[PDB]
Amino acid sequence: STGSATTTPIDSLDDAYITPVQIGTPAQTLNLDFDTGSSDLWVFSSETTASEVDGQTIYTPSKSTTAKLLSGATWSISYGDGSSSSGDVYTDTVSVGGLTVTGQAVESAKKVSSSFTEDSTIDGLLGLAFSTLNTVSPTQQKTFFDNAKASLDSPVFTADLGYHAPGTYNFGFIDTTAYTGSITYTAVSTKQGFWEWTSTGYAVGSGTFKSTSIDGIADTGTTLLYLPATVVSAYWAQVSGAKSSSSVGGYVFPCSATLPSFTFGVGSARIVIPGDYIDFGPISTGSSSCFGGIQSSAGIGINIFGDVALKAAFVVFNGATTPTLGFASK
């Protein structure tokens, strides 16, 4: 089997992407944030504290004839950005772009943190990291991909995120018309539960490529590109007036600037992030100070190849017995 679903930016800055997901019988369609950096499929629901729901579409398990309470199971997750959610668990039928999993754990939120409430466009998350990170207790549950894998034509999914435009998540096949040149594959460590890999280096604008190993995660659920302070400093040094602002919480730059591109290495291959992808607009409405899309990972504890990097590529998440990651230009 295969599936194919369009993923759409939630706003004009590409802060995140939502993909429609069918849950239950009859289908209840929710728009979920596909997150290769976590492993829980959780939704706003009829059980969510009412004051914490503000515009989201909810899953109502009592209206699904295929929903079954997973007795005794709870979940609770905290994300790198400080947000969180928790609740109980149902199993139900979940379909993405024509690909159906029966008995998928659907984690129903009883509580969500303010950042989730305040984002009316995201109805939940669909985790696509390794199932070892799943938070369901006392019996850990599998991700949608993990459940689908054996039935897929090929044990893969691909992320093709758009810049200020829709893109695609495909399951079970590689669309050879969706990228240019070749896909370069690179090794993955699953030791921390992530799609963790090592970039071979970077360039800033038309500058020379610096060969240096950068270990990080391919994370569709993180907006920006978080890299070591040395790398980030070298980038922003090429932008007149750019500076790190502790009050704002990262590098900012004059909105009148033209940003240079940023290249990252995948083996001997190179992915070029155009400068415009690195512009996240005014820090506050009407400001002429703009927020940068490349930020330091110092104090995160891990480098994160988030949407800024991933949307510059066609990305293969290969869930073969030994997982690998593939990157192509597009």
Q: What DSSP letter does each residue of 35-68 carry, written as one string?
A: ETT---EEE-BTTS-GGG-SS---B-GGG-TT-E
Residue count of the chain: 330
CB of 233 closer than 8 Å to CB of 250: no
Closest CA to 42 of 78, 7, 17, 4: 78
Strands annotated E in 172-288: 184-187, 196-204, 210-218, 225-227, 243-245, 250-254, 262-266, 269-273, 279-282
Strand duo 99-112 + 41-43: pairing = parallel
Q: Which residues are catalytic?
A: 35, 199
Give CA–CA dist 265/327, Å, rounded.
Answer: 10
Dihedral sign (CA 245, 306, 134, 62)? positive
Tokens 């001997």 found at: 268
Helix (H, G, I), strand (E, B) or coil at 229: helix
